[PDB]
């Protein structure tokens, strides 16, 4: 049927100040401003209370699959706020059997050189999304710490250095080599 109204409030923290031009939300706080446009989604984004301490997304006369988009907007703005209060840290770990994978970073964090993967001579230069800073952390044999604000960008660039390290024309159950996303967390904690 058509549900007359489905809606969902995001309880935003005082550290953050969100505003919206139409349904293009902006989220700024401690460590930068994130903007995500929702021109495609077709909802009523209302910002209520003095000092704007909650975002409220309404969907009038939505069918089942259009009611599904209410929480997905709510979840993005939650992820937009975690990404500005706390940031996003994807601690991901190089697994290898015999050949150690030499991970060295260029371009002050923007590009990762991947060498010696299955003892291959081809060196793989995988770029990060604009606003993700990859690094090699301390007291870790095999570790890439990806850091950025936008979860969309940090995670997409984590998937790039995982799908770069794909074993072609072998059993991938014996050959467990490659750099895999080992942990999804936040840069500065709660």
């Amino acid at each position: 049927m058509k549900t007359i109204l489905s809606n969902q409030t995001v309880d935003i923290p005082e550290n953050v100040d969100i505003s919206l031009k139409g349904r293009t939300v902006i989220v700024k706080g401690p460590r930068g401003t994130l903007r995500r446009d929702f021109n495609h989604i077709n909802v009523e984004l209302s910002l209520l209370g003095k000092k704007k301490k909650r975002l409220r997304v309404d969907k009038w006369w939505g069918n089942r699959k259009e009611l599904a988009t209410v929480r997905t907007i709510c979840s993005h703005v939650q992820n937009m706020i975690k990404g500005v209060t706390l940031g996003f840290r994807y601690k991901m770990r190089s697994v290898y059997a015999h050949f150690p994978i030499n991970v060295v970073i260029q371009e002050n964090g923007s590009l990762v050189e991947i060498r010696n993967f299955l003892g291959e001579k081809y060196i793989r230069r995988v770029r990060m999304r604009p606003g993700v800073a990859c690094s090699v952390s301390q007291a870790q044999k095999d570790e890439l710490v990806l850091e950025g604000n936008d979860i969309e960008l940090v995670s997409n660039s984590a998937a790039l250095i995982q799908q770069a390290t794909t074993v072609k024309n072998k059993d991938i159950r014996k050959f467990l080599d490659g750099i895999y996303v080992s942990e999804k967390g936040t840069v500065q904690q709660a």
């Binding site: 058509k2 009523e44 984004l45 209302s46 009038w60 006369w61």
Partner: protein, 138 residues
């Protein structure tokens, strides 16, 4: 972002149909796309009416959803919607549109000759306002 809402006791202008150019008050919402409506003071009988033919205004007045015509007529005359309508710019340009359609051929001559002189006396002053725009840069 919406301001006008289909609510119990919202006055809505009826755009077209049998009761075109009248104010009906939403008594009860029947369906997804149809409302029980009454206009006791604008001579619209208690009846069903679809949302597609009604342009909802910024006049809400308090009566219950079940309320019979007697208690819609009271809240209507109490609010005094028929005068607050005629005051509204919406209703002022409805009667302008009416007057323009009922403009006689002799009535059209008088407003041709009026406009003409009314437009000359501005287009003089637009030319004079614009010499003051030129002069202040020299």
């Amino acid at each position: 972002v919406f301001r006008r809402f289909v609510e119990v006791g919202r006055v809505a202008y009826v755009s077209f149909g049998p009761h075109a150019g009248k104010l009906v008050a939403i008594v009860d919402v029947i369906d997804q796309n149809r409302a029980l409506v009454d206009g006791p003071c604008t001579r619209v009988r208690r009846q069903a009416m679809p949302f597609k033919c009604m342009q909802l205004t910024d006049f809400i007045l308090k009566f219950p959803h079940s309320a019979r015509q007697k208690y819609v007529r009271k809240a209507w005359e109490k609010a005094d919607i028929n005068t607050k309508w005629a005051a509204t710019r919406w209703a002022k340009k409805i009667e302008a549109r009416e007057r323009k359609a009922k403009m006689t051929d002799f009535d059209r001559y008088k407003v041709m000759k009026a406009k003409k002189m009314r437009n000359r006396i501005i287009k003089n002053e637009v030319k004079k306002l614009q010499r003051a725009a030129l002069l202040k840069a020299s």
